[PDB]
Amino acid sequence: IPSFEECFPKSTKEHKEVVHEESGHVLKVPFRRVHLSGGEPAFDNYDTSGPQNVNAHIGLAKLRKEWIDRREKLGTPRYTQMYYAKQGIITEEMLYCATREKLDPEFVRSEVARGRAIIPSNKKHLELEPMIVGRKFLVKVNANIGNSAVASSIEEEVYKVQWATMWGADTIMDLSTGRHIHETREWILRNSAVPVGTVPIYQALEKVDGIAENLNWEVFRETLIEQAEQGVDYFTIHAGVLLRYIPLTAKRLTGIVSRGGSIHAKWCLAYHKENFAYEHWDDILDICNQYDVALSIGDGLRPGSIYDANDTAQFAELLTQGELTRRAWEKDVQVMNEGPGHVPMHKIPENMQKQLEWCNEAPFYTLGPLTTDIAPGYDHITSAIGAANIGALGTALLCYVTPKEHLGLPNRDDVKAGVIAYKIAAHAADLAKQHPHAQAWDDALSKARFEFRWMDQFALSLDPMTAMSFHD
C-alpha cells in the first residue's frame, strides 16, 4: 500500500485557512503543494485525498459539526444549500468551495441559488470536505465502489475510497448490493472526505428480496430516509422512466442498459402503472430538504450502444428530467441530471444543447460518453474522448469508466487507470473552456520538461511514479 508521499513525491498536504464572517468559524481548505527545484515557485493543486492514516474504526474528524449545530440553533424551515443561497446567506460550505475553486463566495452563492451548481452536502455527513459541481467550476470526476467478489473487511472497504480519491476522484458512489448494504455504507460515510452518492432503488430491491414487482413507494420511502440519516449526499433516482416511454425502447439494439432504469421499467410493465418515484416526487422533495440530499435525476433510458444514441426514448426522458428539475427547485432541492452513455462524437453537441435548454442549465453528469463500441478492454479510452468533449461543452461531473467496463469487476489497477483517464478528460475540458488558471499546470510541467528538471516534471504529473518508472 503506497502512502500519499509515495504516490506524490515532493508534494505536501496543506490547508488554506479562511474565516466564515457570519459565524466566525475557521475553515481549513485542503490543497496539495508540489515543491520544485531551480528557483521555481511551489505549485499548488486541488486535493481530494482527504485526511491520511486515520483509523477506520474511529472515522474521520467531524469537521462540519459546529456549522450544522449553529444552523440548527438558529432554526430554519429547510436545510439545503439552495435554500440558504436564495435567502442571501453565504454558508461555510459555500465559502469552503469558493476558496477551493479560487472564486468569489458571492459567485458560488449565485450559482447555487440559480440551480446551475450544487454542493452535495447532507448535514449528516459531518466528515465531508465541501466541493461544488457546476459548469462554472472545475470539471469533477466520480468513481464507483461496490461489492468485491469476496466480502471485504472495514479496512478493505474504506481503502476503495482512499485509493480512488488519492488519484483524483471528486465524488464516490456506493453501488453495493447484498445483505450488508447498511453496515458497509456506514464504514464508507464515516471515512469519506468526499461526497458519497447512492442509487437507493438498489437497496429497496434488496429489502423485497430481489423481486422488482414487490417494490412500491412505501419501501422506497423508507429506504430514502434510512440512507439520508446515514449521510448520503446525493440519490440517483430514475423518476423519468415513465410508463409511456418504455415502448419507445422497442426498436433499440441494446434496450434498457441502466440497472435502475431496468428495475423501474419491470415494475411499470408488470402493473401498467406510472413510475412510483415520479408519482411521489413531491414526497421525495420533503425528505431531501430536511437533510440536504441532492437529487441526481437518473437517465434510466440512457443509450447502451452507438446505434441507440440520441433516440426518441432518450430525449423523452430528458424532457421529463427538466420538469422534475424545475419542480425540485420549487422546494429548494439541489439537482443535477444524469446523461449518456454511448454516443458518437458528432451526436455529442445535440446532447448538451438539449440538456442546457430543457433542464435550465442544471449541472449535467455523464457516463463518458463512449464514442465507439469496438474496443471492450479499453473503454476508459473510448469514453475519455467523449467525456473530454462533453465536458468542454459544459458537463459538470464525469462518471468514470475503467478498462473492465462491459467485462468484469475492476481491481485497484483498473480503478487507478479509470480515475487517471478521467482526470485527463476533466482537465482537458477545463483548458478548452479557458477556465481561469487551468493552463498554469500544463505550463509548469512543460517548463520543467524544457529545462530538464526531470524530478519536477514527474512531481507535477497526475501519476508521478508511473512517469518516473517509465523514464528509468
CB of 388 to a second copy, least distance (A): 5
Footprint of Co ion on residues 237-256 (CB under 5 A)? none
Answer yes or no: is 463 a known binding residue.
no
Interface residue with a second copy, options 154, 356, 373, 455 (CB under 8 A): 373
Per the DSSP assignment, residues forming a β-bridge with 143 are: 172
Interface residue with a second copy, options 4, 107, 217, 378 (CB under 8 A): 378
- Asked if residues 48 and 165 have their Cβ atoms less than 8 Å apart, the reply is yes
DSSP reduced 3-state for 17: strand
Answer yes or no: is 202 a known binding residue.
yes
Number of H helices, E strands in the chain: 19, 13
Burial of 357 (0-12, 13-18, 19+ CB in 10 A): exposed
Give the phi and the psi of residue 423 in degrees, each rounded to 5.
-70, -35
Name the segment binding Co ion (CB under 5 A); options: 64-72, 191-199, 222-230, 297-305.
Answer: 297-305
Interface residue with a second copy, options 16, 114, 354, 433 (CB under 8 A): 433
* Contact pattern from residue 301 through residue 330 relative to Co ion, giving x for each residue in contact according to CB under 5 A and a dash for the rest: ---x--------------------------
Return the DSSP state at 176.
-
CA–CA gap between residue 179 and residue 170 (Å, rounded): 28
Pick 245 or 458: Cβ nearer a second copy: 458
Return the DSSP state at 401.
-
Q: Does 287 bind a second copy (CB under 8 A)?
A: no
Q: Does 377 bind a second copy (CB under 8 A)?
A: yes
Name the segment binding a second copy (CB under 8 A); options: 29-37, 184-192, 208-216, 300-308.
Answer: 300-308
Nearest residue to 321 (alpha-carbon basis) of 442, 236, 412: 236
At 442, list the grid cell: 500544463
Answer yes or no: is 258 a known binding residue.
yes
Per the DSSP assignment, residues forming a β-bridge with 286 are: none
Give the phi and the psi of residue 120 in degrees, each rounded to 5.
-70, 110
Interface residue with a second copy, options 291, 304, 328, 397 (CB under 8 A): 304
Nearest residue to 297 (alpha-carbon basis) of 288, 306, 308: 288
| Cα angle, residue 194 at apex, residues 357 and 160 outer, rounded to 5° | 115
CB of 99 to a second copy, least distance (A): 22
Alpha helices in 235-308 (DSSP H): 259-271, 276-279, 281-291
CB of 372 to Co ion, least distance (A): 11
Answer yes or no: is 394 a known binding residue.
no
CA–CA gap between residue 433 and residue 388 (Å, rounded): 11
Q: Does 403 bind a second copy (CB under 8 A)?
A: yes
* Binding-site sequence positions for substrate: 144, 173, 202, 238, 258-260, 299-302, 338, 365
* Binding site members: 144, 173, 202, 238, 258-260, 299-302, 338, 342, 365, 406
Q: Which residues lie near Co ion (CB under 5 A)?
A: 304
Residues that bind a second copy (CB under 8 A): 253-255, 304-307, 342, 344-346, 371-378, 380-382, 384-385, 388-389, 392, 403-404, 406-408, 420-421, 423-425, 427-429, 431-434, 439, 441-443, 445-447, 449-450, 457-458, 460-463, 466-467, 470-471
